[PDB]
Design an enzyme around this catalytic site. Structure first.
Site, PDB file in Angstrom:
ATOM      1  N   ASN C  27      13.965  24.483  83.648  1.00 51.50           N
ATOM      2  CA  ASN C  27      13.970  23.160  84.237  1.00 51.50           C
ATOM      3  C   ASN C  27      13.554  22.010  83.253  1.00 51.50           C
ATOM      4  O   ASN C  27      14.255  20.986  83.140  1.00 51.50           O
ATOM      5  CB  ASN C  27      13.100  23.115  85.468  1.00 51.50           C
ATOM      6  CG  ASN C  27      13.221  21.787  86.180  1.00 51.50           C
ATOM      7  OD1 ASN C  27      12.586  20.792  85.773  1.00 51.50           O
ATOM      8  ND2 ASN C  27      14.109  21.732  87.177  1.00 51.50           N
ATOM      9  N   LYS C  61      11.662  14.650  83.223  1.00 49.33           N
ATOM     10  CA  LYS C  61      11.968  14.565  84.639  1.00 49.33           C
ATOM     11  C   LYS C  61      11.641  13.116  85.069  1.00 49.33           C
ATOM     12  O   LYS C  61      10.476  12.766  85.332  1.00 49.33           O
ATOM     13  CB  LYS C  61      11.158  15.570  85.451  1.00 49.33           C
ATOM     14  CG  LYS C  61      11.131  16.997  84.885  1.00 49.33           C
ATOM     15  CD  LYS C  61      12.509  17.535  84.536  1.00 49.33           C
ATOM     16  CE  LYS C  61      13.351  17.784  85.782  1.00 49.33           C
ATOM     17  NZ  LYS C  61      14.593  18.544  85.495  1.00 49.33           N
ATOM     18  N   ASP C 251      10.669  22.508  90.095  1.00 47.46           N
ATOM     19  CA  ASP C 251      11.695  23.309  90.759  1.00 47.46           C
ATOM     20  C   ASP C 251      11.480  24.836  90.742  1.00 47.46           C
ATOM     21  O   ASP C 251      12.435  25.594  90.847  1.00 47.46           O
ATOM     22  CB  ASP C 251      13.090  22.925  90.241  1.00 47.46           C
ATOM     23  CG  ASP C 251      13.529  21.527  90.717  1.00 47.46           C
ATOM     24  OD1 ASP C 251      13.131  21.127  91.834  1.00 47.46           O
ATOM     25  OD2 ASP C 251      14.260  20.844  89.967  1.00 47.46           O
TER      26      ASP C 251
HETATM   27  O1  LIG Z   1      17.200  19.034  85.550  1.00 49.25           O
HETATM   28  C1  LIG Z   1      18.222  19.127  86.282  1.00 49.25           C
HETATM   29  O2  LIG Z   1      19.127  19.913  85.974  1.00 49.25           O
HETATM   30  C2  LIG Z   1      18.382  18.344  87.526  1.00 49.25           C
HETATM   31  O3  LIG Z   1      19.236  18.623  88.357  1.00 49.25           O
HETATM   32  C3  LIG Z   1      17.452  17.229  87.862  1.00 49.25           C
HETATM   33  C4  LIG Z   1      16.424  17.953  88.665  1.00 49.25           C
HETATM   34  O4  LIG Z   1      15.908  18.979  87.813  1.00 49.25           O
HETATM   35  C5  LIG Z   1      15.331  17.017  89.142  1.00 49.25           C
HETATM   36  O5  LIG Z   1      15.870  16.010  90.008  1.00 49.25           O
HETATM   37  C6  LIG Z   1      14.290  17.796  89.901  1.00 49.25           C
HETATM   38  O6  LIG Z   1      14.965  18.625  90.875  1.00 49.25           O
HETATM   39  C7  LIG Z   1      13.336  16.801  90.557  1.00 49.25           C
HETATM   40  O7  LIG Z   1      12.864  15.893  89.545  1.00 49.25           O
HETATM   41  C8  LIG Z   1      12.188  17.520  91.232  1.00 49.25           C
HETATM   42  O8  LIG Z   1      11.954  16.980  92.536  1.00 49.25           O
HETATM   43  P1  LIG Z   1      10.457  16.767  93.082  1.00 49.25           P
HETATM   44  O9  LIG Z   1       9.860  18.150  93.060  1.00 49.25           O
HETATM   45  O10 LIG Z   1       9.815  15.797  92.100  1.00 49.25           O
HETATM   46  O11 LIG Z   1      10.641  16.179  94.460  1.00 49.25           O
END
Ligand SMILES: O=C(O)C(=O)C[C@@H](O)[C@@H](O)[C@H](O)[C@H](O)COP(=O)(O)O
Ligand SMILES: O=C(O)C(=O)C[C@@H](O)[C@@H](O)[C@H](O)[C@H](O)COP(=O)(O)O
Ligand SMILES: O=C(O)C(=O)C[C@@H](O)[C@@H](O)[C@H](O)[C@H](O)COP(=O)(O)O
Ligand SMILES: O=C(O)C(=O)C[C@@H](O)[C@@H](O)[C@H](O)[C@H](O)COP(=O)(O)O
Lengths: 283, 282, 284, 284
Positions: C27, C61, C251
């Protein structure tokens, strides 16, 4: 195009008319409790000057669980309704779950309701339409507002033009409902101006993914009832209970009965205002 | 994971080779039904896929009062009797009223609960009591973790042979999407009931002002591939030699001449996935 | 014909009729060694199975829900880590770009630039990413219908970048939940002249508690959903993993446990190899 | 108590128990004279009816679907136009901000800064807007649940800006359509310590053709939806208008025909005045 539906003496529903309250309880449990709650509604609506039709179901035919309470059933339920009408002089609305129930229900009830899940069932809708009373069609959670016309047409085909359309929310992801306030006009205009009714109670339903019975959001009934009534509609559909946590069906969405007058004075004030303000032809 | 025995040589289960619940939308006449069923029987025999023939005797839920409903219960059961005797194939049909369950069950080998009616206690109980396997169409309005309550209604009156059939979830107005995550949730929350994918009805969509359902048959292989790859007990499919002329759900019908092309892909994918382990992902 | 191929690096080309390309990694960049160790695992598994491979990570992020949630090492350290990954393993890398001004410096090091889901309509960001001259991976917003990606592809084409791939990550389904419409893949490909379509199985598993402060997720179901997507016939799979997903700093609830990488990828290759040699049916 | 008031300018304060504030204007700045003329219409109507007023326009449409669609005069000319609007009419102005660096210069002129719906999760943009020191209007993303706005408010609070308002513009409902969940208003207010809630009736009317180039919209239903939202009891209404909406260069399908402004606003004031003097019921 607006159409007015005469329900009983002094009770007519229509989109340009003062709103009619289709109010009562979720399910018939006993004679006295039904009489006592209806009495409260009759006194409050008489005081405020709001036209009134009492609602209750004789059967809950669609409970999620085989163990959940269903109500006193058709034979006892019609006896209760007969005693409600004779005691109070109030018209009554109840829902009909099988074709063969329509005729006997129509002997006693003044409006027959088509349940949401069953509104596409041709033989049920036709049997309800043929019974010769006004019909309240609950708009299924799965049906877009421009598709109600086909239900109205079924009824019209067998000679029943007294059809009202009742909003109860649309499926919004899993286990949740949203009310699209744009749908009320779409229902009215695509059906030749059928009265549109807002079921604020069932529109508040939601559920836990693993739950046995519906959840619900009674604490927000005023927010949503305000919004709907401001649009300009023929009626409000509302369930109440003196202690909603003890109701045997849809307690999570029921209005606490002692708040009925507080809610209805706000509805009457908003309804009287919007009903004397013009539509704008916005092109 | 529970296996449902339907008839000789036909058993459905989530770890078994998929069963095809295949046929036509609605019964119109004897000979056309026999001819179409003959084609399914030939294709499935050649490919070695277990087969149950589907049709409706009545379309009880058409949007319009003017739309075609089919030959009806009495003529429909006569057609089915002849289909069974001619081909030796089991049949599945849907049941709209409690009182139809027992007479339908004399002829049909699986009874289907229609999507809209899956919460109707007396219908479900009447279908369960008729003593044949039950295919529950998952309503467009029901989450996958709520089917358990329909299965329990059937279990309460002694019918443990229940299968669960995906046909899409409401996605805005007039459109369906299929959540491929729901299959596992249906199986695991119901003690391992066979899960079936109705690829045909999952393709439904409509025009906001239309009189009959729209549909997306040109994408049947995309969706069927996806669902069969998850690892499921069955595929539910309707076809017609000329789908534009079908009297119900033509827009989602497979053109019949493409049945073998579709089924060979389903068998290849199904045989592969059915021998690959689950991973316990914690 | 009907399908466009995007060359990413020597021996790595993505296209809807070609063997799928794995855009796999982690991630967020946290440190050099952990990044190298995880990438090494991917390289070893993909080499053994014969799957073309592009390593993924975010340097930042930029869209966490909470001001207190971890954001990663940032641009300068992130690009240094990516340079070391490329030198050590010879593998191409993909990372996401959050501001127009980041596109050019990121493109010096990264081999694919990703447009974040929320940002895919932002003209200046898309155009700055397209101009940097590398293949673009457009994450399809949760709010965007599959037949609307063509406008993002057109923005890129307008500034001379034809090398655009389209990445599914789910559609908003009520509040705080996603569903993947498997019918969208074809709609994305056909309405854009055959752009490669990629399935982000990890972010498609996201969901949340209405009052939570970080994303929920459904990693226990990754194989169900990955099997479904790969069977449709697509150009790539986008996947995040972690050796202990409960301790991942972003994530984690959707991350594949890293020790299960080979078990997952052998199923994806087997399904992909099968469906890629089966014809389309022209259903009229 | 249960409700926070945001002072915007002398005689303009937004709050959930206060008379509603109109954030009204036009979609995009095209020229000085047309902007002045339209604002004049709003000023005349709002002065006559006694509605507090903040004039809205965008200096840039940074998120058009199509690279060929009109974007507006841009930041430099847009701020000059706003300066003239303020001087001529003495009205405060609201505009949206698309990049962190734009926040400070915009805040020299504008009296409220708006976070665009697609960008409301972008930490650095939200923080830069909050730091610029003016009230913030957060457009609730089509993808965000009402109980998640609190995290945006917290980002602002973290850098010292407590003057945050929350603006409904609909939730994604299938593809290419929006629905407004009238239950969300209370959830936004209660989970954020009583932030002012604003209803963007214009953008809530958006919908689109799956293959279209520009947004569709449902202006013929603006009164239905505006009545519904104002009846709930909210701090503000956000509205765009045009003298001939069919010729508007952005969001014409949802724009109020300008000659109907007084007819709409008299209904809003009548409803708002009524509901603002009726109690909440404590429903348990
Ligand atoms: O890195 C990637 O591949 C993505 O798709 C972007 C994605 O990782 C991000 O939007 C994360 O899912 C997001 O920052 C985490 O959400 P939260 O846990 O901050 O609500
Ligand atoms: O009675 C009415 O007016 C109706 O609209 C039908 C309605 O009361 C019923 O559908 C109930 O909401 C339903 O049986 C409750 O479901 P559950 O609590 O069994 O999950
Ligand atoms: O027959 C089945 O297996 C079913 O799933 C029932 C199904 O065929 C029916 O609901 C039809 O889809 C339905 O009547 C079509 O609706 P319409 O075309 O009348 O709008
Ligand atoms: O300006 C505002 O008030 C906003 O809410 C931003 C809003 O105007 C924009 O998102 C427009 O709706 C958008 O640029 C137009 O969309 P499209 O017609 O380019 O698809």
């Amino acid at each position: 195009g607006s159409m007015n539906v005469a329900i009983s003496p002094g009770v007519t529903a229509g989109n340009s008319l003062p709103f009619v309250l289709f109010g009562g309880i979720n399910v018939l449990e006993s004679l006295d409790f039904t009489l006592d709650v209806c009495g409260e509604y009759v006194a409050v609506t008489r005081k405020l000057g709001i036209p009134f039709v009492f609602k209750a179901s004789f059967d809950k035919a669609n409970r999620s669980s085989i163990h959940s309470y269903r109500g006193v059933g058709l034979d006892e339920g019609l006896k209760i309704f007969a005693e409600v009408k004779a005691r109070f002089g109030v018209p009554v609305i109840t829902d009909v779950h099988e074709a063969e129930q329509a005729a006997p229900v129509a002997e006693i009830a003044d409006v027959l309701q088509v349940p949401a899940f069953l509104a596409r069932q041709t033989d049920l809708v036709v049997a309800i339409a043929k019974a010769g009373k006004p019909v309240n069609v609950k708009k299924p959670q799965f049906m877009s507002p421009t598709q109600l016309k086909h239900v109205v047409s079924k009824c019209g085909e067998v000679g029943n033009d007294r059809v009202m359309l009742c909003e109860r929310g649309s499926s919004f992801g899993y286990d949740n409902l949203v009310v699209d306030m744009l749908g009320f006009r779409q229902m009215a205009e695509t059906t030749g101006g059928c009265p549109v009714i807002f079921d604020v109670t069932h529109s508040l339903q939601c559920r836990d993914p693993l739950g046995d019975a519906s959840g619900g959001r009674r604490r927000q009934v005023l927010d949503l009832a305000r919004a709907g009534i401001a649009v300009g509609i023929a009626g409000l559909f509302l369930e109440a209970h003196p202690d909603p946590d003890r109701a045997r069906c849809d307690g999570p969405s029921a209005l606490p009965l002692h708040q009925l007058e507080g809610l209805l004075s706000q509805m009457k004030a908003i309804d009287d205002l919007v009903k004397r303000m013009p539509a704008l032809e916005i092109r």
